[PDB]
C-alpha cells in the first residue's frame, strides 16, 4: 500500500481455483482462498496461492485442461482518510514462487525475435 500514513483500510485478496464462475463480487471471492488485509504499520500483505491442480504440472500457455484459477482484489471495508489527505492512492503488486516451485521441459521463448 502506497498511500499516506493517515489512510486506513481493509482489503480482500482472493484466489478461486478454476471450474466455476469467475468471481465478480466479493460474495463469491469470499468463498475461495483469501486473505483479509488490514492496512497499517506493516505496509505489505502476502497471499499464498496454494498448488491446487489436477495435473502434476500445468501448461505454460493458455490451456483449459490445465487452467489455474482466478485472483482478485476487493474492498473489505473501504479506504478512509482524514481531511487534508490525498483521497486517491496506489497499491503495487508483486509475484514470486515458493520453495516448492519447479519447471520442466526447456523450450524457446516467444518473447524475443529477430526479423530477417
Amino acid at each position: 500500500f502506497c498511500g499516506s500514513m493517515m489512510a486506513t483500510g481493509k482489503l480482500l485478496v482472493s484466489y478461486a481455483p478454476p471450474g466455476a464462475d469467475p468471481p465478480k463480487k466479493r460474495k463469491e471471492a469470499m468463498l475461495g482462498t483469501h486473505v483479509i488485509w488490514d492496512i497499517g504499520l506493516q505496509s505489505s500483505c502476502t497471499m499464498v496461492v496454494p498448488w491446487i491442480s489436477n495435473t502434476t504440472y500445468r501448461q505454460t500457455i493458455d490451456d483449459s485442461f490445465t487452467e489455474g484459477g482466478y485472483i482478485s482484489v476487493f474492498y473489505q471495508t473501504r479506504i478512509v482518510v482524514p481531511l487534508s489527505t490525498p483521497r486517491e492512492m496506489d497499491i503495487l503488486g508483486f509475484v514470486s514462487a515458493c520453495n516448492d516451485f519447479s519447471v520442466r521441459l526447456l523450450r524457446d521463448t516467444t518473447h524475443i525475435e529477430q526479423k530477417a
Binding site: 471450474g19 466455476a20 464462475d21 495435473t55 502434476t56 504440472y57 500445468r58 501448461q59 505454460t60 500457455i61 490451456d63 483449459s64 485442461f65 490445465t66 521441459l105 526447456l106 523450450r107 524457446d108 521463448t109 516467444t110 525475435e113 529477430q114 526479423k115 530477417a116
Partner: protein, 283 residues
C-alpha cells in the same frame, strides 16, 4: 519372482475320479473365470512343460517401432512468389492405424519413447541438374514456442528447442524421450471435456471437444531442408518411427473392431460390419 521367461507350470498326471468335487460346474454370473486345467476334466499324464510367455510380456509386445506420419517438402519453379518450403506436423500417434490399435488394448500407459527418422528424397522433372547432399533440420517445438513462419526466420536458430541435423545418406536419425506426460500416466482415452460450460456464460464460450485434453498435447515437429534453394527441385520425405520402451500399462480394454475415424472413438457409417458369414452348424 516369476519372470517372463520362466517355464509355465507342468501338467500333473491325474487319474479317474468319482466325487463331490465339481470343477466343471461354475457360474459366470459372479464375473469370475473358472480356473480350470486339463487335469480337472480329463485324465492326464505328467508333462514337463518347457514353453514360456517371454514373447508376450508387455515390453516385448510393443518392441517394434511403427510409422506415424509422412512429412513432405517442395520446391517450385523459382521463387515466383513462394518461399514457404517447410513441413510442420502436430505430434500425435492417432494419425495411422497400426500403432494406434496396439496402444488401445489398454487405458493408460507410461513409457520412454524412442524415435527413429528415415529420410528419403528424389527428383521431379527429368533434368540434367544435380543436387548436392542435403542436410535436414528436425526441430521439436514444444507447446508454446514460436512456430516457424518463413523458411528463413528467427525461429530456426533454436536456442532452446532440441533439434536434429540429419545429413542425407547416413544411418537414420534417432533420439530418446523420457515419459513426458503431465499426468502420472498417459491417457489413451479421456471421457470428458476441457471446459465446463457455465450457465452464466455463452454456449460458445463454454464449448469444447469431447474427449480432448492437454493430457496429450505434445507439440510439433518442424522439418526443413537446411541447404539453400537449388535450381533443380528435390522432394523429401521423413518417416517417423515410434517405439515405446520401458513401458507399463493399465486397465485392459477390448480392441478396436471397426475402422478408426478421427482421433476419437467415433465410427463411420458403412464400416460397422467386422464379422463375416458362417453357419452355426458348419465347422
Amino acid at each position: 519372482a516369476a519372470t517372463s521367461r520362466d517355464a509355465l507350470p507342468n501338467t500333473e498326471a491325474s487319474g479317474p475320479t468319482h466325487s463331490k468335487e465339481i470343477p466343471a460346474l461354475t457360474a459366470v454370473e459372479t464375473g469370475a473365470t473358472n480356473p480350470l486345467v486339463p487335469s480337472d476334466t480329463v485324465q492326464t499324464r505328467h508333462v514337463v512343460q518347457h514353453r514360456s510367455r517371454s514373447e508376450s510380456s508387455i515390453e516385448s509386445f510393443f518392441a517394434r517401432g511403427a510409422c506415424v506420419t509422412i512429412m513432405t517438402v517442395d520446391n517450385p519453379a523459382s521463387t515466383t512468389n513462394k518461399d514457404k518450403l517447410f513441413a510442420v506436423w502436430k505430434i500425435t500417434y492417432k494419425d495411422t492405424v497400426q500403432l494406434r490399435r496396439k496402444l488401445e488394448f489398454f487405458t493408460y500407459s507410461r513409457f520412454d519413447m524412442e524415435l527413429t527418422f528415415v529420410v528419403t528424397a528424389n527428383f521431379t522433372e527429368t533434368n540434367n541438374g544435380h543436387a548436392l547432399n542435403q542436410v535436414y533440420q528436425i526441430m521439436y517445438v514444444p507447446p508454446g514456442a514460436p512456430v516457424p513462419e518463413k523458411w528463413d526466420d528467427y525461429t530456426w536458430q533454436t536456442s532452446s528447442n532440441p533439434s536434429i541435423f540429419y545429413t542425407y545418406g547416413t544411418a537414420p536419425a534417432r533420439i530418446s524421450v523420457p515419459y513426458v506426460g503431465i499426468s502420472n500416466a498417459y491417457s489413451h482415452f479421456y471421457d470428458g471435456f476441457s471446459k465446463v460450460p457455465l450457465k452464466d456464460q455463452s454456449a460458445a464460450l463454454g464449448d469444447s471437444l469431447y474427449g480432448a485434453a492437454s493430457l496429450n498435447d505434445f507439440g510439433i515437429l518442424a522439418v526443413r531442408v537446411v541447404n539453400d534453394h537449388n535450381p533443380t527441385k528435390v522432394t523429401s520425405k521423413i518417416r517417423v518411427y515410434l517405439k515405446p520402451k520401458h513401458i507399463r500399462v493399465w486397465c485392459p480394454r477390448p480392441p478396436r473392431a471397426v475402422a478408426y475415424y478421427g482421433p476419437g472413438v467415433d465410427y463411420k457409417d458403412g464400416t460397422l460390419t467386422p464379422l463375416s458369414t458362417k453357419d452355426l452348424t458348419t465347422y
